[PDB]
Design a protein around this ligand. Structure first.
Ligand code: FES
Length: 112
């Protein structure tokens, strides 16, 4: 919450394979790390209220265990995503912590 504090690196790989790295404060969500940095391929129609699926991302294999799977309420919204995979998550549901420093997520070809 303290601005610019305890920053964690988050790597956003778009559908073409181009990676964009940003730093976001611990406690913020991965969706906020993308929106605040104008990252392509990620949207936040509902602003992080788990009411849409436009913040959909694929969690890199190496980070799946630490990030975890989607919650039941996240699943219901994920049903509206495009090409939802086992490693799919709504980025606004992923809270950044120290152990996610270096996280890699890939944005899908389509959000809506
Ligand atoms: S921004 Fe709407 S569900 Fe994540």
């Amino acid at each position: 919450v303290p601005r610019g504090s305890h920053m964690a690196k988050i790597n956003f790989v778009d559908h073409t394979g181009e990676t964009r790295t940003v730093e976001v404060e611990e406690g913020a969500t991965v969706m906020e790390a993308a929106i605040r940095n104008a990252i392509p391929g990620v949207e936040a129609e509902c602003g992080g209220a788990c009411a849409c699926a436009t913040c959909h991302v694929y969690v890199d294999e190496a980070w799946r265990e630490k990030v975890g799977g989607p919650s039941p309420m996240e699943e219901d919204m994920l049903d509206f995503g495009y090409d939802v995979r086992p490693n799919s998550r709504l980025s606004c549901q992923i809270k950044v912590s120290n152990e996610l420093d270096g996280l890699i997520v890939t944005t899908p070809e389509r959000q809506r």
